[PDB]
Amino acid sequence: NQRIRIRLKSFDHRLIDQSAQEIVETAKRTGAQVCGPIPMPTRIERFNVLTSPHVNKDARDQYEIRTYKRLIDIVQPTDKTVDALMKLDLAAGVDVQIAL
Amino acid sequence: PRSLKKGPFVDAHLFAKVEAAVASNSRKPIKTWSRRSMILPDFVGLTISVHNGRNHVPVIVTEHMVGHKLGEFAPTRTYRGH
Amino acid sequence: GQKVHPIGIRLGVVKRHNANWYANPKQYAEYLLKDLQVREFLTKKLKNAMVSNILIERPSGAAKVTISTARPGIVIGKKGEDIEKLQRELTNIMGVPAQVSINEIDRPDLDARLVAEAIASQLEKRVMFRRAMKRAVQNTMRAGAKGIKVEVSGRLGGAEIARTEWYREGRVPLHTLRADIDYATMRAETTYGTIGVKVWIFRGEILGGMKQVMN
Amino acid sequence: PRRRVVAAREILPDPKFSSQTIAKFMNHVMQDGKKSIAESIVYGALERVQEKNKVDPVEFFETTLEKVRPMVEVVPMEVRPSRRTALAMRWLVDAAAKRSEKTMALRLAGELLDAAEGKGAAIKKREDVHRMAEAN
Amino acid sequence: AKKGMINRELKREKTVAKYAAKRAELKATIANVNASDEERFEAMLKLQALPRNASPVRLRNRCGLTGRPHGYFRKFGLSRNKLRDTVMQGDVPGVVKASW
Amino acid sequence: TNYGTGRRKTATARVFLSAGTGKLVINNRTLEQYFGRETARMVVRQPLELLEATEKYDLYITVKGGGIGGQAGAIRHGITRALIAADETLKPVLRQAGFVTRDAREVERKKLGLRKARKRPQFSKR
RNA sequence: CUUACCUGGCCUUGACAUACUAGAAACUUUUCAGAGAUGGAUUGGUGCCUUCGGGAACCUAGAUACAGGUGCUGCAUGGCUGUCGUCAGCUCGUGUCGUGAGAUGUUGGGUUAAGUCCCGCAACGAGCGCAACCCUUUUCCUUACUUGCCAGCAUUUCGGAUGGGAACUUUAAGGAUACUGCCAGUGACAAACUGGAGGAAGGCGGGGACGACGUCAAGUCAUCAUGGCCCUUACGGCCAGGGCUACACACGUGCUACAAUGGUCGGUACAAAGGGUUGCUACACAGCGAUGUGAUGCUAAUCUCAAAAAGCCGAUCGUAGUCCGGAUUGGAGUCUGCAACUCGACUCCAUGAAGUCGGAAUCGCUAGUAAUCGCGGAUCAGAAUGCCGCGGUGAAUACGUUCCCG
Ligand SMILES: NCCC[C@H](N)CC(=O)N[C@@H]1[C@H](O)[C@@H](OC(N)=O)[C@@H](CO)O[C@H]1NC1=N[C@@H]2C(=O)NC[C@@H](O)[C@H]2N1
Numbered sequence A: 001n002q003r004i005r006i007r008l009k010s011f012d013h014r015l016i017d018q019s020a021q022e023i024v025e026t027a028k029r030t031g032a033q034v035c036g037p038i039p040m041p042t043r044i045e046r047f048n049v050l051t052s053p054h055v056n057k058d059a060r061d062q063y064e065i066r067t068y069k070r071l072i073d074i075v076q077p078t079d080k081t082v083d084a085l086m087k088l089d090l091a092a093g094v095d096v097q098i099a100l
Numbered sequence B: 001p002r003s004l005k006k007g008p009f010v011d012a013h014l015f016a017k018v019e020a021a022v023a024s025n026s027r028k029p030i031k032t033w034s035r036r037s038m039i040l041p042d043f044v045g046l047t048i049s050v051h052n053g054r055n056h057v058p059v060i061v062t063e064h065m066v067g068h069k070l071g072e073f074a075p076t077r078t079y080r081g082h
Numbered sequence C: 001g002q003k004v005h006p007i008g009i010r011l012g013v014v015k016r017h018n019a020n021w022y023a024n025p026k027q028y029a030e031y032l033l034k035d036l037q038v039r040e041f042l043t044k045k046l047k048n049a050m051v052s053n054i055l056i057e058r059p060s061g062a063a064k065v066t067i068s069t070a071r072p073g074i075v076i077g078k079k080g081e082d083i084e085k086l087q088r089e090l091t092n093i094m095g096v097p098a099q100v101s102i103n104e105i106d107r108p109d110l111d112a113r114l115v116a117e118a119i120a121s122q123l124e125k126r127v128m129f130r131r132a133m134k135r136a137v138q139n140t141m142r143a144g145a146k147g148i149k150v151e152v153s154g155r156l157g158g159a160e161i162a163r164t165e166w167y168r169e170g171r172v173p174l175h176t177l178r179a180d181i182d183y184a185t186m187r188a189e190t191t192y193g194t195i196g197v198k199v200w201i202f203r204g205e206i207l208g209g210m211k212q213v214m215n
Numbered sequence D: 001p002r003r004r005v006v007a008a009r010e011i012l013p014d015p016k017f018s019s020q021t022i023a024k025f026m027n028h029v030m031q032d033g034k035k036s037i038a039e040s041i042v043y044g045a046l047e048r049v050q051e052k053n054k055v056d057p058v059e060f061f062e063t064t065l066e067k068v069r070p071m072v073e074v075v076p077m078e079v080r081p082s083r084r085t086a087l088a089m090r091w092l093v094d095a096a097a098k099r100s101e102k103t104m105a106l107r108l109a110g111e112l113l114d115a116a117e118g119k120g121a122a123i124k125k126r127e128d129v130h131r132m133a134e135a136n
Numbered sequence E: 001a002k003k004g005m006i007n008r009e010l011k012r013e014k015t016v017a018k019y020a021a022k023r024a025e026l027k028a029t030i031a032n033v034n035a036s037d038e039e040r041f042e043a044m045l046k047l048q049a050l051p052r053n054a055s056p057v058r059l060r061n062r063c064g065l066t067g068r069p070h071g072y073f074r075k076f077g078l079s080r081n082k083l084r085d086t087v088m089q090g091d092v093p094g095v096v097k098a099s100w
Numbered sequence F: 001t002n003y004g005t006g007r008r009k010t011a012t013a014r015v016f017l018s019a020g021t022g023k024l025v026i027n028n029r030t031l032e033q034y035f036g037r038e039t040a041r042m043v044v045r046q047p048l049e050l051l052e053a054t055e056k057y058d059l060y061i062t063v064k065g066g067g068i069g070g071q072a073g074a075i076r077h078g079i080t081r082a083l084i085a086a087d088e089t090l091k092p093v094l095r096q097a098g099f100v101t102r103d104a105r106e107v108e109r110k111k112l113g114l115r116k117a118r119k120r121p122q123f124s125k126r
Numbered sequence G: 001c002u003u004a005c006c007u008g009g010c011c012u013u014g015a016c017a018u019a020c021u022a023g024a025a026a027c028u029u030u031u032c033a034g035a036g037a038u039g040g041a042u043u044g045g046u047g048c049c050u051u052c053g054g055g056a057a058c059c060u061a062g063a064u065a066c067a068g069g070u071g072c073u074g075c076a077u078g079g080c081u082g083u084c085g086u087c088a089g090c091u092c093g094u095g096u097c098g099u100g101a102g103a104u105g106u107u108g109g110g111u112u113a114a115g116u117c118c119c120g121c122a123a124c125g126a127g128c129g130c131a132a133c134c135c136u137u138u139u140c141c142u143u144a145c146u147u148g149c150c151a152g153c154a155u156u157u158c159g160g161a162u163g164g165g166a167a168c169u170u171u172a173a174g175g176a177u178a179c180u181g182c183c184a185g186u187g188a189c190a191a192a193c194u195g196g197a198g199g200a201a202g203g204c205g206g207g208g209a210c211g212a213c214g215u216c217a218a219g220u221c222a223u224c225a226u227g228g229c230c231c232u233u234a235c236g237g238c239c240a241g242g243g244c245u246a247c248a249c250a251c252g253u254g255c256u257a258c259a260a261u262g263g264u265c266g267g268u269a270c271a272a273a274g275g276g277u278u279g280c281u282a283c284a285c286a287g288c289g290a291u292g293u294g295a296u297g298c299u300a301a302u303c304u305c306a307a308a309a310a311g312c313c314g315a316u317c318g319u320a321g322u323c324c325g326g327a328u329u330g331g332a333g334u335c336u337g338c339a340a341c342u343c344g345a346c347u348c349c350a351u352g353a354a355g356u357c358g359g360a361a362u363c364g365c366u367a368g369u370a371a372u373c374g375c376g377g378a379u380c381a382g383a384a385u386g387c388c389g390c391g392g393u394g395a396a397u398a399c400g401u402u403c404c405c406g
Helices: A013-030 A079-087 B012-023 C028-045 C072-076 C081-094 C112-124 C129-143 C209-213 D020-029 D035-052 D057-068 D081-098 D104-117 D121-135 E003-031 E037-049 E080-088 F038-051 F068-086 F091-097
Strands: A003-010 A033-039 A043-050 A060-075 A094-099 B030-032 B047-051 B056-060 C051-057 C063-069 C098-104 C147-154 C163-170 C179-190 C193-205 F002-008 F011-019 F024-026 F057-064
Touching: A003 A013, A003 A079, A013 A033, A013 A060, A013 A079, A013 A094, A043 E080, A060 E080, B012 B030, B012 E037, C028 C051, C028 C063, C028 C081, C051 C112, C063 C072, C063 C081, C072 C081, C072 C098, C081 C098, C112 C129, C112 C147, C112 C179, C112 C193, C129 C147, C129 C163, C129 C193, D020 D035, D020 D057, D020 D081, D035 D057, D035 D104, D035 F038, D057 D081, D057 D104, D057 D121, D081 D104, D081 D121, D104 D121, E003 E037, F002 F068, F011 F068, F038 F068, F038 F091, F057 F068, F068 F091
Parallel strands: B030 B047, C063 C098, F024 F057
Antiparallel strands: A003 A060, A003 A094, A033 A060, A043 A060, B047 B056, C051 C063, C147 C163, C147 C193, C179 C193, F002 F011, F011 F057
8 A cells, every 4th residue: 555645735826836736747757646636725814903003993904824735646656756756846935745 | 719629728938927826825916918818727816917008907817707818808999988 | 195015015916925935833933033033134234235135935944045136246255255154144043054145136226225225325424305316216217117206204404394205207006906116115314313215116017917927 | 865766676476375465564574584483473463364254365465455555645745656555564563563462463463353344553544644634 | 112021021931941840740740649638739839839930821922023012913923013014015924915 | 317506695505307206305304394484495396386397307405505595595596407407498487587597695794893794883973 | 920000128330232351161959038029058060162272152250331211202203094085186298378476288068986988179298096907706617536525336234334436516726708799779870878688697796905186283202213301329120019990970882681573491403714732622420510530533624612593393471570681699619820809700509680662862774785693713821792704584765855964
């Protein structure tokens, strides 16, 4: 039972899509079979910040930050695939976790 | 109130003083700032000066007082009417 | 009469972030605090090197600081010892190994912060305030921007009653979200208090959206 | 509205009888969005009248509404047809609010029955309005 | 804030870290049921005899830049006044204006 | 054998329609044990009553999300589009009766400085 | 604690910065006096780099320039914010007229949500505003098939539970579509306006963000910065206890009610969004209960908060200050915390106040709106009827501009 599984987290969906696309294209080069990417539900968190220094309760900025997630499976991988993926260059703004 | 499984709370510096007074027979008042200590049976018959914010007011402990906090007998606010 | 921040409003629309890293919720605060420390340190240390933009990346346990400068010789040093010294100081500050990359601006007059710094320096060098902003406006317009607005506020000329002057030339479409507008602010410290300087520079519209910007 | 002319909304026919007038009566009865409670009240009021005198509920309601409709309002002016039904319905439901008897279903059935014969605060309201109109 | 208050917070934060291990051990002893009631009672007395600043209940979250004690926002470590400026000039990754 | 999808106020219904003798089932329950209130049952049954074909089909329905009214509306929409997929000539009649439109009304968000979508706090001059 | 205020106890180059001088690694145990701040003893350790002459870290001791100030001036200022007001306007160059301040352009007929668009004209041309580009929701398509899904087949402990399937719902990236596009009138046979078909949607489909030149010496020296003034054995700094929670009264904003369209008891359905490793906890046992103990999964489309409530069915109460209401008070407890007296939340027993729809007057709202029902979060050891969000059920009325306000 060999199946690599990769999870990606980011604050920018364009960057996360770039990384996932490039990862699957790298794996197909070594020739293993790929399932995904599977988009997972996005986390959205929101904050209300008073803008005035002293007193205006109705004057606020509303900010949000989003966490995007992607999941990929590599099934029946060859010997080249594992070290190629581990060699793959890290892109800033994206967190990648690899599990056996 | 404080949970029964924990037992009563008494400040250590007040407890040592009251125990010394009990072991001796001093009639000198004890002087404390510990408004939060609860009156135990050993406190009965003694004189404790409890701070109220500006002065230490004297309290003679009777049998009924046991179970209350010391600060209950030294009010902190002054009111005489409008 | 209060205007939204021109970069804040179009962040994530046509403009990217000066910080680009991911962190877990329990590391976000420490990362952000150390990044702010780095910015505050670099501003002071390169006050005289025409630094405009600082970009911070954390790929994995390491930091890449990109400094956009118009005087690369001063920042790098005669032999390149200064970049190493800066790398050591920033490594100490961040607690992780750090590296520095220089990005040279080709046209300083097209940049918002450099122009504001020049106006503020002249104002505390006691040049009459109306000459400095006309000079900056015509310099940028000749450099080839599509518009510029300049504003100065405070005790202009050492007067008792403070006031606000401004001067605009060209196009400055603030409400158009896809417009590419650069903005900066500075403080000039004079004998009679603080004077504030604001600059807007418009350099055409960004077509294709953030898909084209490739965020 | 000073700018434009609004269109009255489209109320749906009642499910169990298919009567738009009965649906409107339900909407006048309902409070706080409790359509089920309003429907229970309306049906309980209809069944009492059907049992005490055997008429088809739809026709009986229409005929009683026709009796209760007022021809003049509030300087008399003339009412539009929709205001006729609105005013008649509102008077019909208001009287049952003040009537005796404990439950509202029977309180409404009492007014429905008595208005058919010609006694009821709803009809007295129409009477007073027409006395005022003929006075002016 | 005044410099005295900022230094006072640092002193409290130092004392807490100084006594954390002993405080945790004493609380574990109190929670231990196998130990004798006499042992638990002495553990309680030692915990009550520890210095006041060792208790984490006395720390107050302050802005990392200014020391403001109101409007803290744990996720960033900054109070609202500095949070708004740093966000709006584009130095906090992932945060944007929110509309929905 | 034919399929329809209906939506109304966060509720979604998937409807399978086939030839049969009036067997209708929702979430492995009968209509009367599923919908307690009775207007909901007419809302569900309307599309077949309009076509006079109550006894000519079997309906297998699954619904998720929303409340009792929204689920009934979604089921009605799904039945209508399943019938349209079955026969394209019934669409004029169904559109005339109005069952084809997707009701796009939804809950308005709460706004800053307001108690609700539109309601304001009480105001006073002095 | 916060804390800036009061009472009392203390320190003086200072709790914090730099420069000068000397000595010690820095640090560490245990104990006594005291309310603590502090003071006095008692231990162990004595480290790293080093052209090793020493240096670095850190502390202590001395000296003066200084530090420090939530002290004053928002009428000396920067930055930031409210308001007219999402109101439709506001300006410039070159010409021409006038001794001149100034004027024209920007005016006049339609039309629009709009200085939006068409026509005429000593004016000819530009800029900021309006619209659009941005987010979200409504229909369809492609990519993607797990932790999410179950139409067809198979097993089954009838639990998508299992083998399987990639259909459907969903998740979330990228696209398509709506443009007066077509038909009938209207207008000047301009702009534009009124009806119809198709279509998920028809004339700006709904909501959000975005705030023009300027006004109010509007607000903030207590977020921060900063000119000037002022204190510096005290207006600076440390501590314990108290106060910010007082109470003859007056006002603003809310919550719960005054009941039968209801209260109580039993049975039984249907959400969305969000939080969780110092955390959330399945399950079992103990307790009337808040909770306690053991134990299991979870760094989460996987496990959990979690019971949605109003709703539906059956019973009872029969208009009473009540089987309405739930204030106040006596007694007994649980939890957080070093510690709940002043001054926490919650649980159980008992008690059962005012209140029977509210004077003159005044406020919100035009549709998934008002009304009503529950659910979540930030702050946070604990402490929401406030604030910011989420869905469920779901109305009535608009003839019109005469009057009130802008
Ligand atoms: N708590 C108050 C503290 C004292 C103030 N801070 C002192 C202050 O500000 N003086 C200012 C200051 O000399 C300067 O103003 C600027 N900007 O420097 C001048 C220039 O007008 O005006 C003074 N003020 C005035 N007020 C008066 C007014 O309105 N009409 C009449 C005449 O008396 C006016 N002048």
